[PDB]
Design a protein around this nucleic acid. Structure first.
Ligand SMILES: [K+]
Ligand SMILES: [K+]
Ligand SMILES: [K+]
Ligand SMILES: [K+]
Ligand SMILES: [K+]
Ligand SMILES: [K+]
Ligand SMILES: [K+]
Ligand SMILES: [K+]
Ligand SMILES: [K+]
Ligand SMILES: [K+]
Ligand SMILES: [K+]
Ligand SMILES: [K+]
Ligand SMILES: [K+]
Ligand SMILES: [K+]
Ligand SMILES: [K+]
Ligand SMILES: [K+]
Ligand SMILES: [K+]
Ligand SMILES: [K+]
Ligand SMILES: [K+]
Ligand SMILES: [K+]
Ligand SMILES: [K+]
Ligand SMILES: [K+]
Ligand SMILES: [K+]
Ligand SMILES: [Mg+2]
Ligand SMILES: [Mg+2]
Ligand SMILES: [Mg+2]
Ligand SMILES: [Mg+2]
Ligand SMILES: [Mg+2]
Ligand SMILES: [Mg+2]
Ligand SMILES: [Mg+2]
Ligand SMILES: [Mg+2]
Ligand SMILES: [Mg+2]
Ligand SMILES: [Mg+2]
Ligand SMILES: [Mg+2]
Ligand SMILES: [Mg+2]
Ligand SMILES: [Mg+2]
Ligand SMILES: [Mg+2]
Ligand SMILES: [Mg+2]
Ligand SMILES: [Mg+2]
Ligand SMILES: [Mg+2]
Ligand SMILES: [Mg+2]
Ligand SMILES: [Mg+2]
Ligand SMILES: [Mg+2]
Ligand SMILES: [Mg+2]
Ligand SMILES: [Mg+2]
Ligand SMILES: [Mg+2]
Ligand SMILES: [Mg+2]
Ligand SMILES: [Mg+2]
Ligand SMILES: [Mg+2]
Ligand SMILES: [Mg+2]
Ligand SMILES: [Mg+2]
Ligand SMILES: [Mg+2]
Ligand SMILES: [Mg+2]
Ligand SMILES: [Mg+2]
Ligand SMILES: [Mg+2]
Ligand SMILES: [Mg+2]
Ligand SMILES: [Mg+2]
Ligand SMILES: [Mg+2]
Ligand SMILES: [Mg+2]
Ligand SMILES: [Mg+2]
Ligand SMILES: [Mg+2]
Ligand SMILES: [Mg+2]
Ligand SMILES: [Mg+2]
Ligand SMILES: [Mg+2]
Ligand SMILES: [Mg+2]
Ligand SMILES: [Mg+2]
Ligand SMILES: [Mg+2]
Ligand SMILES: [Mg+2]
Ligand SMILES: [Mg+2]
Ligand SMILES: [Mg+2]
Ligand SMILES: [Mg+2]
Ligand SMILES: [Mg+2]
Ligand SMILES: [Mg+2]
Ligand SMILES: [Mg+2]
Ligand SMILES: [Mg+2]
Ligand SMILES: [Mg+2]
Ligand SMILES: [Mg+2]
Ligand SMILES: [Mg+2]
Ligand SMILES: [Mg+2]
Ligand SMILES: [Mg+2]
Lengths: 64, 48, 6, 84, 96
RNA sequence: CCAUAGGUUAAUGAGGCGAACCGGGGGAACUGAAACAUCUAAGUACCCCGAGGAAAAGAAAUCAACCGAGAUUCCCCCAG
RNA sequence: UUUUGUAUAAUGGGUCAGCGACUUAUAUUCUGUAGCAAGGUUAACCGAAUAGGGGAGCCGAAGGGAAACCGAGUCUUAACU
RNA sequence: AGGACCGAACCGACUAAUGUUGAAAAAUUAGCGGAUGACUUGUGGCUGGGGGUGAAAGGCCAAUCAAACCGGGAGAUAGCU
RNA sequence: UGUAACGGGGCUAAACCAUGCACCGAAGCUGCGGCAGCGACGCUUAUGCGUUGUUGGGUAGGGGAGCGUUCUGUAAGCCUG
RNA sequence: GUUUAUUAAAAACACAGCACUGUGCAAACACGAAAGUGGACGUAUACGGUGUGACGCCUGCCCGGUGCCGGAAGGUUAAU
RNA sequence: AAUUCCUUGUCGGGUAAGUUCCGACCUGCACGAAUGGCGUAAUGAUGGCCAGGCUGUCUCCACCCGAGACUCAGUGAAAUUGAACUCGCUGUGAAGAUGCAGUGUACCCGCGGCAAGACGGAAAGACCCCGUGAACCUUUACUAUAGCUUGACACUGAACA
RNA sequence: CUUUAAUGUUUGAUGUUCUAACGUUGACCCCUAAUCGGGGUUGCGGACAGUGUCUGGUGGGUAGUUUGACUGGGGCGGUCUCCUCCUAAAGAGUAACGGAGGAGCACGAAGGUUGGCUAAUCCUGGUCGGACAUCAGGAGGUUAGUGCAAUGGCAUAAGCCAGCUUGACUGCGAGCGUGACGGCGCGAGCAGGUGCGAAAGCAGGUCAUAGUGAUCCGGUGGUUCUGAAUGGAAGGGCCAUC
């Protein structure tokens, strides 16, 4: 039968042009007052998944 | 610990706010500061 | 009896 | 078999090592921005084309070669960038 | 995804975004496709008949990809700045 | 009291068995979740009732999207 | 066999013969190979039936953006050196 | 008269020896307790598994009992050998 | 438990120190024969030979290349009283 | 007297006796989706549950805690 | 003390000599009044201790009678078993050697005996730990839930205060 | 409007009485040659009781489960994240139930900037006044100070005082450090708008290194980005934040 997507992975990663994955940074949900603006500013833009992690992500998203 | 979080809200009609802490015990008077409002793109009084 | 009993 | 009660230590603690020290040595060619030293005080002081960040990091303000020197009346160590 | 019990990567990162239903009913057409319609006019219907876009597509856009080398009237499609230039350069008429 | 219940007789039918499939009435747990309770396993196993050569479903108080389709069932897609 | 390490006084086997353990299905990715190639390929089904028909679809030739949207760019930002 | 006494049958099972691939998956031999009773025994009946029954030992429920047996879920699961 | 604190015999050097030259001694090195991997270089691409250099202990484990077994076609063929 | 059939027969269990407590009879209580049945063809001098354990002499202080019984003004508080 | 750790407490009795026993003391680690206290005639295959009698229990064994054991004839198992041409010692060594080193001793093969070793046989250690194992048991662990209990609405009406 | 009557009306509670639902494991009759059942009749009880649905309490009676790891065996004890020093072998890093201490904040100034200033301790003299207050001079030279541990720093002070202030800015960010990763850190410069300074300049918190908590779920404000026929809306997204 068809492989099933890990649906929680599909909600957190998106496949980019050369087949990397973009994700949203951790640490910008709450406890924001104590964090510096510079730190929060650099967490706003999406980031690429690292080489160590790509295996794990790809396994979760066979139809990405 | 004892310091509470507060919003400093723009006196311009925008929603914009900064957030910070205050020792409410020692300094009961309301914090007012001119800060940059990025919605209007101007330094303006913030309050609270 | 138990070998090497408790 | 008798076993004597142990006791305990009140020590056991330590902090994570901070990876301070020299990152680029004398003569090494750096791009502007390159961290040259992480330090706790100004063990080293900023010379020409070198900035001192808020944690006393010294970093290159220009592209060039790192140069260590002893300068001034306190014989303080300075780091500069020689523009190449 | 299992990492030995450490909070795994697909859980320690936040969810983001939402899925647009409108995206699913929108398509992109290339300049290479415009000659494939058979007729000359390129409506949403003629693209469907040429099997260029899906049956359920409501909106379409013509995009500078490939080349057009023939007069083509484009009717009721969005067209990119570059695509417009390309079509007009070949003698085409773009009409909203 | 009338009557009704009750009683007797006759006629007609049922009863029981049987593989799977089928409709219905009830309905687990191991297990998985690297523990576990929501969740899963699964409306599965199993019990029970009923039927037929098939059953069930079925002729829009259905979809659709301002264009249209036109009962039910089954197959491939849509789509992990 | 298991171990840092076994002649080990650690495990297993009395012997022989026969049997006895990485499979199958479907998805997915990569390698090889073959076909065709900006295209490739059809499913169910139809069919004098491994042909032929069937292109419904699917993958590919465009991306960026949460999205509207724009598009060889796009997002970010009032705007980018 | 008697949950009276001594003591066979009958019902038990305190001690020792033997036996321990037994004559026997609980016995034999020598002693031992009860022996008109809350006794013992034949035949038949009833109570069914989180259930029975228990003068209570988690005892007994077909040589099985801190949840019988048989079939099924079932190739449970086994980061272990 | 038995000499039992040179491995034994035995040794007054067959001990120890110094100097020296011989010799023994390994699956090390060399010689002779053979096989294979990889690289270079030219024959010349069916990728073969040729030359040259070098390498070839191996568990887990990765890679490469084969043997044999039963069954299908080739096979109403071929072998076989 | 009883008991671990098959390593324990005892100081264990039971026991007459004692006490607390429930129970007014369609009893309490128990088995039972229920009907019903046992309790009992009994009726508080009876029946159930609990502890203690012939008999003799006896059984002291504590109601703060946890239960149980009684109260119900007030506070709090469900569906509605 | 069926309770006392210290403890063989101390004192007395009994014995030549008594960590046990009996009497007593009270310093009750840690008795105590119906999860009864103290006592108690009788009773007990009940626990402890002392006597008389009695004896192969023993000093310390001897002899005898029977059944096996032994030999012959007939029948004919079993556990175990990597393979064995299966010695001692001192060393060595996965650390306790028939098997390694060194050395000593030793002609080949039965039968009756004995059990020191073959870490002998037997049962994938019950102890112990581990497993994000199991069971059953406990409770003011968590979450549920039968039961019991509360009220609302329904079955459910009338009249008057 | 604050108090307060009367009437009407809508309700709720309470107490009586009733009978006709309902109960009867009271009597009698019949089905009937029947201690079941049903029907009839008559007493008693009576809108109670009882049952259904909903609902609070109670509930080891029963069920499903959980009850951490490290550990010189396990238990008991101690520990678990973060900062500083040593161990650590002169780059980084480096273990033990090794040796020693700290943190889970504080501060609208204790932040920014301009201007100015310079410590401890001792000695001598001096009213109350001493070993130690404040004053003066000398010696001394940081033996002080640093909001809080330790280390490294600090006089151009980062230490002390004052004026003016909000850069404890918003968008970004060449380039580097440090991490398996999540991530964490340092950063010139660019745009906008600001503060201090005559000006060069400095300022994106604090001498630096602790003062912390992923994701999920949800809350608050903003933003039309989305909006399941269409217009809206709900809900979702995005930004800020709890
Ligand atoms: K660097
Ligand atoms: K389950
Ligand atoms: K598991
Ligand atoms: K081992
Ligand atoms: K063993
Ligand atoms: K494959
Ligand atoms: K291929
Ligand atoms: K059972
Ligand atoms: K299985
Ligand atoms: K007995
Ligand atoms: K009390
Ligand atoms: K009380
Ligand atoms: K005691
Ligand atoms: K009691
Ligand atoms: K008594
Ligand atoms: K030897
Ligand atoms: K032996
Ligand atoms: K009546
Ligand atoms: K009622
Ligand atoms: K309970
Ligand atoms: K240790
Ligand atoms: K040890
Ligand atoms: K200041
Ligand atoms: Mg947010
Ligand atoms: Mg010992
Ligand atoms: Mg198509
Ligand atoms: Mg039938
Ligand atoms: Mg599980
Ligand atoms: Mg039909
Ligand atoms: Mg070992
Ligand atoms: Mg060896
Ligand atoms: Mg062995
Ligand atoms: Mg051996
Ligand atoms: Mg083992
Ligand atoms: Mg074996
Ligand atoms: Mg074999
Ligand atoms: Mg008698
Ligand atoms: Mg018996
Ligand atoms: Mg006998
Ligand atoms: Mg007797
Ligand atoms: Mg007798
Ligand atoms: Mg027990
Ligand atoms: Mg049995
Ligand atoms: Mg069970
Ligand atoms: Mg199953
Ligand atoms: Mg199995
Ligand atoms: Mg000797
Ligand atoms: Mg060689
Ligand atoms: Mg050679
Ligand atoms: Mg070699
Ligand atoms: Mg090799
Ligand atoms: Mg008796
Ligand atoms: Mg027994
Ligand atoms: Mg016995
Ligand atoms: Mg008792
Ligand atoms: Mg009460
Ligand atoms: Mg003692
Ligand atoms: Mg004495
Ligand atoms: Mg004596
Ligand atoms: Mg005494
Ligand atoms: Mg007592
Ligand atoms: Mg009392
Ligand atoms: Mg008693
Ligand atoms: Mg014979
Ligand atoms: Mg030895
Ligand atoms: Mg012999
Ligand atoms: Mg013997
Ligand atoms: Mg053995
Ligand atoms: Mg084992
Ligand atoms: Mg155990
Ligand atoms: Mg339980
Ligand atoms: Mg379970
Ligand atoms: Mg542990
Ligand atoms: Mg170092
Ligand atoms: Mg070093
Ligand atoms: Mg200053
Ligand atoms: Mg400061
Ligand atoms: Mg500080
Ligand atoms: Mg709408
Ligand atoms: Mg709608």
């Amino acid at each position: 039968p068809k492989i099933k997507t890990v649906r929680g992975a599909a909600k957190r990663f998106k496949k980019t042009g050369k087949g990397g994955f973009k994700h949203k940074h951790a640490n910008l949900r709450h406890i924001l007052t104590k964090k510096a603006t510079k730190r929060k500013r650099h967490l706003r833009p999406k980031a690429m998944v690292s080489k160590g992690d790509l295996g794990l992500v790809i396994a979760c998203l066979p139809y990405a | 610990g004892i310091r509470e979080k507060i919003k400093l809200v723009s006196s311009a009609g925008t929603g914009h706010f900064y957030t910070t802490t205050k020792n409410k015990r020692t300094k009961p008077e309301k914090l007012e500061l001119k800060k940059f409002d990025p919605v209007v793109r101007q330094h303006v009084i913030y309050k609270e | 009896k138990c070998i090497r009993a408790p | 078999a008798h076993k004597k009660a142990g006791g305990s230590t009140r020590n056991g603690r330590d902090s994570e090592a901070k990876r301070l020290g020299v990152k680029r040595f004398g003569g090494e060619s750096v791009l502007a921005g390159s961290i040259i030293v992480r330090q706790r005080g100004t063990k080293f002081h900023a010379g020409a084309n070198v900035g001192c960040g808020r944690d006393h990091t010294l970093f290159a303000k220009a592209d060039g070669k790192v140069k260590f020197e002893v300068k001034g009346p306190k014989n303080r160590k300075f780091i500069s960038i020689e523009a190449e | 995804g299992f990492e030995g019990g450490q909070m795994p990567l697909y859980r320690r990162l936040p969810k983001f975004g939402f899925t647009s239903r409108k995206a699913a009913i929108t398509a992109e057409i290339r300049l290479s496709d415009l000659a494939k319609v058979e007729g000359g006019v390129v409506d949403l219907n003629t693209l469907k008949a040429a099997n260029i876009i899906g049956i359920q597509i409501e909106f379409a856009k013509v995009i500078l990809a490939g080349e057009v080398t023939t007069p083509v009237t484009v009717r009721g499609l969005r067209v990119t700045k570059g695509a417009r230039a390309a079509i007009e350069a070949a003698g085409g008429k773009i009409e909203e």
